[model samples]
Target chain A: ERLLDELTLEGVARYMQSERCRRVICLVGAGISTSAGIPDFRSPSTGLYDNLEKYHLPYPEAIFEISYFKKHPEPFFALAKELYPGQFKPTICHYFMRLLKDKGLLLRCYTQNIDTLERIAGLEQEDLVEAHGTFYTSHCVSASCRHEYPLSWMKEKIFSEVTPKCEDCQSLVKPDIVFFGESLPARFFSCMQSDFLKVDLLLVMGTSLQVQPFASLISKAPLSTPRLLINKEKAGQGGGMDFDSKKAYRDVAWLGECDQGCLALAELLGWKKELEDLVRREHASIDAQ
Target chain B: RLLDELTLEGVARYMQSERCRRVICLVGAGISTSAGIPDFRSPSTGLYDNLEKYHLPYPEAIFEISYFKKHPEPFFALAKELYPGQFKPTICHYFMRLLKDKGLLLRCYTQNIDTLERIAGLEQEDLVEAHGTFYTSHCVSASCRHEYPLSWMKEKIFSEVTPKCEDCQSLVKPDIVFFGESLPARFFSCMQSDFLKVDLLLVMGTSLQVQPFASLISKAPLSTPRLLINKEKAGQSGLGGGMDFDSKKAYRDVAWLGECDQGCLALAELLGWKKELEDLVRREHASIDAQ
Candidate 1:
């Protein structure tokens, strides 16, 4: 069998421009939004897990655990006020996904981040499969009657420090975000079944890809598809991500900050000017508001 | 910043300076591929892919011990097609022989079952077949575990019938490692101390995907120079056991990517043993034919 060209950022760009590459899917995590001042969940010292001392909960992850939130919704609501979408802006990484969409190359963006930065950066609702769910919508925790609420309803009560109750069931209203015990959104499974089949290029960004279902997405794609990892450091080693072996001829690891890696790739694709201009205009609009 | 450059010339110069003696080679199917013996894991052309006629539960089931206990026909059928005598050792095998002749060889660990290293004239004590070899056969019965010569199984295998133990009439299979069976005792017994003393490590032809055998790359000391000669890179550095071959952190590691036999020929030329290697191949190959 013939071998693929060497794994490099230039090779990735060349493939991007080639007719063989079209449907590009991205798997993103919190690292993409860290430069926007949102701390990731797993990083040492600076992560949300490390900074949860003030929350005074049993554990750092308790704030996101469904069972913990069922009994103690106060801590989650308190943290949600600080982490809610309107407070922060999207980074160059988010804009990169937007650029993929603008260039008509984006298949879908499967983000593990519930931050809604993808939505803020201009990716439409249909363009994303928020694997961890999103803060843009809320639902009542009642098994009998599940009432849906918009982000505005949850935000008002979160900021006011009031326990958000469903208008119909008077049950605890929480963001549709997936918790530790809860199953991922139905859309995540449905979209993956079809999306992985046609994905020509996969961009794994800013995520360690340790979480199951989401991490397993890397293996679902075609074996011959070119995969690119843009992260702070190497990851997915023992996992399905292949960076070594004859099968890994097309995998490239561009190690660095997520945004910087995106900028370098955009530079190679000759989309740097458009990407920078988009970021500038979006940040300016957010500032004006 | 590494002290030594990551190149074939650097490895050759290190060997020439006598700083790199006691060379240990870790090899896989790539070395045997040139001998017309197909590798196990290559995509379309590999043995696993072309095993459609067996019609088993899965392709890998042919090697699974549990599957073999119920139906051993598939493996025996495959063995008849791939018995060691059919294939002659290539330049890569002679290269290892050349290393032993030069007194630089400490040991060679192979993941192949072709028995080519032994066929190439490397002493039994100097080689470790991590995957057990086809040079021997034994009964599968637990109680009667009667050992038999390679000729016994070869007769039944060529006759296209599953070999049965002469003692208890239980199924007889070559000693080559199956999926569930433990690796050869010699593999673990030797690797315990061999890697620590090795000054240079030559890893060739392997994809290094399978564990235990692949993990052997990391067994050598960090200071020991490790060079991988394969079609592509394998065993990258990460959390689990893997080769730290990157020039950044893994300073002593070097890689030269190409075909296994070609790489050996190139290395032999670099070490100025090309002619000797050719003579060894020609002489040994004719001897195999004479047999």
Candidate 2:
């Protein structure tokens, strides 16, 4: 019997250490890796929307909207060239999930952000559900042919003078990151059912948890299981940890301000030394380009 | 803590070996017996021989879940003496402190629920209490359960009343390693990854009698030096780290037998931590008395 009194910092740490809290489902978003220099996709005050005015995108989302890419393909590839990885490092936020994988505690990470920081963070690819997709590989934009290109091939194609096109089908080539009109990955639907019943702990991190069906993911967890959030702003409404006095009922432990929140959590869980050591061993993502 | 190859020098060198840092120690009942906790299987004085007072049909009924389910009286009869805050940390328990201080202690997997290691200052992250402790308790009813610290049931346990779950009025059980209860998920989770990285293995107090756990002696690298410090000679196939791998899955073992307290004193003297070890024990004993 798990005594989930209140999801205080200590409660979360003890919960993670307990025999019952084994399967942890982590929901991640762009906020996790933004410290690694990856900008949020739609932040208008930030670069993506503000600077793209020079590119003549009628709407800011046009750079990622499939209908726009299907006809124009000009601005999409222009941005895709810059969106590729190796231009940023994965933050401690990414390594936090990796620590969960290190201990064999992570059930799976349902990620809305397409950066694949979870991959470079050394999480097993099988454990990562890329809900919005990634730039790790490219596919021919043709509905029928759909010829795929390796990451390096996309590396070269996205830099070409014209819209990258598939040689065999002569269709435009694009990285697999999900666009506004694209369907979410098939794995998201397939494994989510098994997850609902299996997960005992849910960690919502670096995400507002509102976008791309991420908000709905929490409702799927077992009603008795606890869902905790770490983010920049208040998420899941009341933030879960405070204001609880019942057993088996977990008030979410909300620690925000992403980077410091993660670091603070590491300290509380007694994983501070180990987490920081693993992060330090990594070369702080030399991908400034 | 690295007493490699069963030699006192080997242990010294292993501690000094830059390449050999991770130390895995599996402790059985032997380590805590010096802390005034009695052994379970011995004759007359041990737990099983003294179980007659509980009126249990069988010796194991003290821990048998089904037996306790029928008659809760016997188990709590046994629970009063064995519960937490009743014992002092012994010298061997204090030795784990020196290992922790050196930054060389990887993990200590303990079988007893005596909770002496915490009193000896071992961090919660490092200690894997394989046989669950009286640190926590909860309702046995799965449908409506609430978890709480051992204190919640203290008055009832002290007064010898059958503690009932407040939520459901069912049996309130201490989270000990009951006979039918499964071992903790924490045990298997850390054991898999943690043991693989061990460079030196220490097995103490245990007779290597328990399942799944008794098998852990082999999980270390065959090249690892496993020193078994026990009341009786067990798991030692050779003298003075006398043998190496028969297979890649085997261990190079040596045995030391004496009272658990003296064995640790000899170990501390050999490892040059005798002074610090003595100081810690005095301080720990002082704290317990003040309490």
Candidate 3:
């Protein structure tokens, strides 16, 4: 119970304001979208899996594997109508990232989601990196035709039912979205190293910190750096069961959802109404800014 | 440039009409919401937004399939809230169904874990639940090598807090792909085959930002028509949502600027499928010609 209390939004806000912290880095997951009606994976009752029918595959990950796709693309395409871009909107929590950027307190945000909500919140391109390849970029699969196209062209092509050709070689164009067999984007690795070396505080939000590469990012942070987790349930660290006992790795604070957590943080920062007003108040002047 | 004026419905219609036989559909969470599933990110109503409701330590823990295997209690506890009975299909779901119904759906690759398409009547031959679903189960212990039907697991999910495979007496886990697990083999096979045959592609709900799945859109036939129905322009525009970048400087930057549901819904309305789609999805009882 005490641990639960410490994980509350107010508790997290206190930790954020504590003088002991200076630089803060955040590791985000899909849980950040819960407020926006997007479901997480672990919740059996309401989670995405529990809501759907059983695919014939042994595991759900097969759906995304390049290997799996080669055999049966129908299952994917059948469900494709739901995942179309722009079907959902960014939440207030996304704006919090922007607030962090504006405050210059955010060192980095290593996200496991491909939704691109961070960018929607106005995070500068330099401060954020899509650990996974983003839909906005595309590249040719053929080495000989390793040409890149503007994501715009791909978007147009997707909507038009027309295949986009390589601008450089007039060959087939493939978005740079990394497939299962594909290697992680090189920039993600470099950014992880850079952020780990410089960040002093780590804020883990939304994600259960289970996915690889992304889950390992927090491990790269200094042992003393304060780590806070904003999630629905507690997650075990990757360092084995023994490492789970270490309180230092545990979240110094926790919050229920990204919106409430960030809202509380804004209040702690004394930017509550200002931020809220900014989101609520829409104007051409605001647009100009 | 001729593609710029086309809407999602236009592209979908073209694909369905056999004007473009080969196609691909890039998917995300919003696509499943009509089926009553929640998106992974987003705030306010998304899974991550209400992390505390499920008593999870972090928001993302909800989607971690491995965690669900260890503690099925929390997962099942929330399942009751997200099941298909609680949600209704969206016009978008019908759109994909229409594709299959019309024999235009080449591939429907999704990032969502929700299996709404199946409920909407999409057959196994026509669906790919990317990111995995809770439809099957396997032993957590590699040596045990046990697997079970997802329904059997679901029946036992709440009753048996720690579900194990009955065959090997090992811990039974949901088939949904966990972070550490391998992806389904079929996903690749379909892509290879579809890539060769696809003439059109549709990417909706998603930000076109996630990897592997995101890249699928670009893997279609060179001459395929591609359409994107996102809340805001993701890859092309420099301003608005998520992470914007100068396309000239780095090729990987993506920008998210607005609401995805509203944007697509507006487009759907404009395409004149509003009433027809709404009726098909059971969203409303109105006639297609009424409006």
Among these predictions, the greatest TM-score belongs to 1
lDDT of 1 at A260: 93
Q: What are the per-model C-alpha RMSD values against the true structure? A: 17.0, 23.5, 16.4
| lDDT by residue (tens digit), candidate 3, A1-289 | 2222354456556656676555678777778877666677545356654343555543455556666655654444343334554444566667777677787777777666666767766676777767766666667656777777775676676666555566667655655655567788777888877878867667778776545766777668765555666665444332321112113333444436667777777887787886786556532234456
Candidate achieving higher TM-score, 1 or 2: 1
Number of the predicted model whose lDDT against the real structure is largest: 1
Cα lDDT tens digits, model 1, A193-286, are: 8998999998999997766778878888887888899987556661366554434566777778999999999999999999999999999998
lDDT of 2 by residue, A26-110 (tens): 8888778778777764332563644676677655556677888888788777776776655556788788888888888988998
Instruction: Tell me how candidate 3 scores on lDDT.
Output: 0.60
| Chain B only, TM-score of each candidate | 0.94, 0.89, 0.73
A110 Cα displacement, candidate 1 (Å): 5.2
| Best-first order by TM-score | 1, 3, 2
| CAPRI quality band, candidate 2 | incorrect
